Amino acid sequence: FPGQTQDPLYGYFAAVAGQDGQIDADELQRCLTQSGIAGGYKPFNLETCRLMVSMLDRDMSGTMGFNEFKELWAVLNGWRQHFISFDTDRSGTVDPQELQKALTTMGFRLSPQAVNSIAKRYSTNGKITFDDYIACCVKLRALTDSFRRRDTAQQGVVNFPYDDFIQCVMSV
């Protein structure tokens, strides 16, 4: 094509993908660190990266390709952007109520009780860090997609058989 160019994100990726163009949660964690997506904030944990791989692992290989990495970057940027509009104090952490308003604006639709529940799960010393916030986000997106694809009748309710429920949530 006439307007082709080198993708700036490929370098970070190629540096850890080796010769098969695929990366695991460990490698994903390293290249994301270099990419600097976590701005000033602390680097992502291996667990959060594990959730990230799972969220985009369409063929269940426990790995991720460059195109998937590109998707992730787009998504993580959106969430950090949203997180930023709440970390006024620029503390690298956010308030429980600020979290309720963050989730609601980014598209999620949870009840006050559910939000309270989620806030409690990721609250360390009253606050929610950037790492936990993102972890929360990928897991929310991940579980909501699955639920969504099982509810094409869009009734907000799905009958989960035990085996399906287990294989579904254990991945995230």
Next chain:
Amino acid sequence: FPGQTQDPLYGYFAAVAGQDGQIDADELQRCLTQSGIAGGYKPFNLETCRLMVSMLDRDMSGTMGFNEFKELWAVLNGWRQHFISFDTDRSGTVDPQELQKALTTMGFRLSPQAVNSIAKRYSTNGKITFDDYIACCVKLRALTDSFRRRDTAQQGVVNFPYDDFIQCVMSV
């Protein structure tokens, strides 16, 4: 008052519980390492410690007491024995076929897909470590309790409203 003896596990605990007699996840990691419960080399990662503290934090303090530690030790040994039964090459790690064996002898009857989902998410590099096997055991227990708890028809199928499905999985 005969038959009384010093509990052999008390040493590990008190060495870290400090004065208040409670331990958080980090200290739990240290106690468990000293007790030599984990294979022999690598200690449990912090997510798995968070999971174990959560599994026994009945008063929601984010800490654990000695009695809860003893109870944890009991559960941990039970799971570990099933692991040992199938770590044929005493590698300290198991593969997908071996994991389904440990899980089945433990009572679970998960499908190839469920077991494969578990393995891929918890796979350091093609086999599952004892550490991830435990974390996996803790989540499986929490999620299975949540599912059964809701099986009204006792048919192995649960009707999950979205909000409820979310709070249930996000709490683990």
